[PDB]
Write a protein that binds this ligand. Structure first.
Ligand SMILES: Nc1ncnc2c1ncn2[C@@H]1O[C@H](COP(=O)(O)O)[C@@H](O)[C@H]1O
Ligand SMILES: [Mg+2]
Length: 413
């Protein structure tokens, strides 16, 4: 129940749109467009429906509030967006101030304008570091002024920056305009997660991977309140196997703080009637290196001193596949092994194959932002799963059961 773009009247209006263009880069070059392309359907909707202008605003990297036009400029994105949009883009060297306001005042109808990095101003995050590297605090009156300037750039506001929705930054919660609508990406992201957090199809399987356990306690706990099954893989699994089974784990990752909560998580799973699938075999490595000598092990055999489990084995792949086969809805957050290294990416690759097949027969498959999304990109499965999230931190907070400041700030329907 929140206002979305498709239900917003834009004809003859200046649209001030927050987008998450915080794209990866490398030596003044974009290394992945995804976030830019993800926001194009919203930009076009506005143009096609007669918007007077669409003023795009975003942050890039973490300049921590000082104009770093040399390393963190959004200028390259303007030329990239012009190619994707097939339309000229007016790039402005600032995002607030009299001159920027004057430029967005009465733009030529159909104008697309891209503002400079919002994080060049400490008022966006509300805090930062000075030149010396010292932490500086934003001033309240300056915060108000900054927000009032952004508000002048449009008659209506659209937030399509899902990747930034967990941030209560000025551009996300401070735009004072009567109409604040979530755009098409934001809509899609919330639509699917509404699936995971409210009315999931069943069985509902949650696949949780990664290294640390302590930072995922809430994610695991929240998911235990909603799923029918849960696969616990990746490095996390070793804390569970060590505690529950007393498995010899070698130099495999072990979370000391998290190990103290393992029995409590299993207890909840039991009470909620959740079937937990943990790995039973592994692909070992003599060291955490892409080219480390590899081996094999099982929970029963244990992992040799010095060696570490970096991926699940064949038997674990079977059990995982069986869980996927039983699911009508799946939420996957975190690969099941070191996917970055080919030798330890096979379990993840195999699981992806199963998730893709599940989607083909009607399973609603939701891939979390970040690492899992990167895997979809690497193996070209974006068009093969139901949803691939554009925001790692944002989707994690949602799966944790948290309210997103950027979503909460939107108008209601
Ligand atoms: N069995 C494992 N051992 C060590 N690292 C793993 C393992 N499985 C997944 N990972 C890594 O954990 C990651 C994400 O960890 P996290 O920051 O907790 O999300 C990726 O960098 C993976 O390479
Ligand atoms: Mg990660």
């Amino acid at each position: 129940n929140k206002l979305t773009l498709d239900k917003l009247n834009v004809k003859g209006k200046r649209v001030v749109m927050r987008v998450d263009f915080n794209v990866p880069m490398a030596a003044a070059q974009i290394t992945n467009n995804a976030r830019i392309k993800a926001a194009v359907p919203s930009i076009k909707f506005c143009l096609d429906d007669g918007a007077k202008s669409v003023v795009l605003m975003s942050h890039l990297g973490r300049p921590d509030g000082s104009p770093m036009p040399d390393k963190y400029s959004l200028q390259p994105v303007a030329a990239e967006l012009k190619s994707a949009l097939g339309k000229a883009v007016l790039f402005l060297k600032d995002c607030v101030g009299p001159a920027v306001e004057k430029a967005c005042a009465d733009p030529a109808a159909g104008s697309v304008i891209l503002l400079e990095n919002l994080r060049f101003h400490v008022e966006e995050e509300g805090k930062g570091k000075d030149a010396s590297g010292n932490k500086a605090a934003g001033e309240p009156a300056k915060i108000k002024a900054f927000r009032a300037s952004l508000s002048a750039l449009g008659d209506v506001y659209v937030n399509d920056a899902f990747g930034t929705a967990h941030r209560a930054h000025s551009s996300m919660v401070g735009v004072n305009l009567p109409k604040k609508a979530g755009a098409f990406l934001m809509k899609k992201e919330l639509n699917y997660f509404a699936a995971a957090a409210e009315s999931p199809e069943r069985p509902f399987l949650a696949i949780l991977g990664g290294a640390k356990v302590a930072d995922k306690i809430q994610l695991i706990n929240n998911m235990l309140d909603k799923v029918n099954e849960m696969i616990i893989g990746g490095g996390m699994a070793f804390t569970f196997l060590k505690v529950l089974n007393n498995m010899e784990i070698g130099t495999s990752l072990f979370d000391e703080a998290g190990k103290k909560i393992v029995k409590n998580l299993m207890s909840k799973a039991a009470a909620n009637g959740v079937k937990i699938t943990l790995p039973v075999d592994f692909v070992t490595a003599d060291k955490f290196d892409e080219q480390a000598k590899i081996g094999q092990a099982t929970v029963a055999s244990g992992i040799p001193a010095g060696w570490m489990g970096l991926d699940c084995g064949p038997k674990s792949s079977a059990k995982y596949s069986e869980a996927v086969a039983r699911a009508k809805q799946i939420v996957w957050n975190g690969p099941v092994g070191v996917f970055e290294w080919e030798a330890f990416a096979q379990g993840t690759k195999a699981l992806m194959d199963e998730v893709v097949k599940a989607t083909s027969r009607g399973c609603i498959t939701i891939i979390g932002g970040g690492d899992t999304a990167t895997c979809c990109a690497k193996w070209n499965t974006e068009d093969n799963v139901s949803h691939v999230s554009t925001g790692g931190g944002a989707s994690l907070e949602l799966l944790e059961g948290k309210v997103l400041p950027g979503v909460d700030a939107l108008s209601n329907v």
